Amino acid sequence: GSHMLREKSEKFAFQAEVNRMMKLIINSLYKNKEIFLRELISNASDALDKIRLISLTDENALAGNEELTVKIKCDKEKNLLHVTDTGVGMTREELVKNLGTIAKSGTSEFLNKMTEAQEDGQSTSELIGQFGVGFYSAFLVADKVIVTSKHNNDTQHIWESDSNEFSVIADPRGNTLGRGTTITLVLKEEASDYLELDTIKNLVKKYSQFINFPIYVWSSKTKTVWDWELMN
Amino acid sequence: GSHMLREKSEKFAFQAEVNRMMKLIINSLYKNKEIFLRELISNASDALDKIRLISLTDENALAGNEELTVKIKCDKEKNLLHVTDTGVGMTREELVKNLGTIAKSGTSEFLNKMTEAQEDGQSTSELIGQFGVGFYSAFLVADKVIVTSKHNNDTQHIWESDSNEFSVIADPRGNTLGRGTTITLVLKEEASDYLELDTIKNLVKKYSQFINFPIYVWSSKTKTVWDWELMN
């Protein structure tokens, strides 16, 4: 089965509106980059509310993973930041549509709302959250953004992009998440500070204060043992 | 009758490598933006060379327009800069493929030399011309780039892009060029200087010196009379 790889059927271009939105976010929040974490944690919380709602009516909802958490891991050696939730997850089709295109039926209005909020010197920090496009703020600190996800209705898939295009492939590691999503950031050289535990704990603790689900950060304590530390 | 519009068959996404290339050009030449005009004049000359070579074997080559020139026009009120040549032109298929994708079988190595130059503080100004991707430097000064072209083997078409996507449509004005291409730039606000005659003349005069085709600028002379003025 070499049809898929040889035909590049795993490669996609972003919808024009998304390209424009990514640029708007990056040029508006250039001064407050740390907000990407708040947006990822917020998306995580939302994904967990969704599976929680589904579990109300679907008895098999939490079979792939019994917990409802958000776990963060800093891999300094690999220069990677991971944010994992055991939320509803996304199917292969959802990864392409939810991350590659924009809807909300208020795109143009928000498109003019973002620019106007950045030509008259305003804040776009609260706007991106409102329109549900916080995910893209990840590019403020990452050269590469990777999304591994497992939804009950599909097999585990990986989405990856450097903002100039994106690809979606079946995860060769198989089903490792159970259910949920991991956002993996390959940090820009200048964003290395986010590989520091103290910086992440302070930020996470700062943005986890109003999150109803438990958020942990893989951290070290004193020999030197590692384990999940509750932040909220 | 209106399938193209109802299906957006006229819209295209850029190839990934082109997105990356446009970014590298803008990130490394932000200091010497005026080079866009050198590149457009250079491409125009190359287009005139092509039709000249075709006229050697084809006696009907120049029937659509006998002259071999480059005519530049400033339109301050409309915030536009036009660069028109009577070269070989481009068919609809060439507009889609040539401006939307990249070949040369050396894109990879070039994107490496570009990024490398930005790391060693080298001059990428010479590099882009050598690889034949000078067209993209227009985005250094324009929010929108429009390409109207007429090739002997097709009808007049229009290519347009704000860099987040591009579309190609049949020109509803019909065949107004005869043969050739017009590059129209909708200038960025920070690029208003290029709407000033004295400035454009100074740049065209400088960049046209070694061009073997006459290059003109639509200018005024003391009543106030407007006409083409030879620059080389």
UniProtKB/Swiss-Prot annotation, chains A, B:
One of its GO terms (cellular component) is endoplasmic reticulum. Phosphorylated by CK2. The keyword Signal applies. Changing E39A: Loss of ATPase activity. ATP binds at N43, D85, N98, F135. The modification N6-(2-hydroxyisobutyryl)lysine is found at K104. GO terms for biological process: ERAD pathway; protein folding. The keyword Signal applies. One of its GO terms (molecular function) is ATP binding. Belongs to the heat shock protein 90 family. ATP-dependent chaperone involved in the processing of proteins in the endoplasmic reticulum, regulating their transport. Together with MESD, acts as a modulator of the Wnt pathway by promoting the folding of LRP6, a coreceptor of the canonical Wnt pathway. When associated with CNPY3, required for proper folding of Toll-like receptors. Promotes folding and trafficking of TLR4 to the cell surface. This is Endoplasmin. It comes from Canis lupus familiaris (Dog). The chain holds residues 69 to 337 of 804 of the full protein.
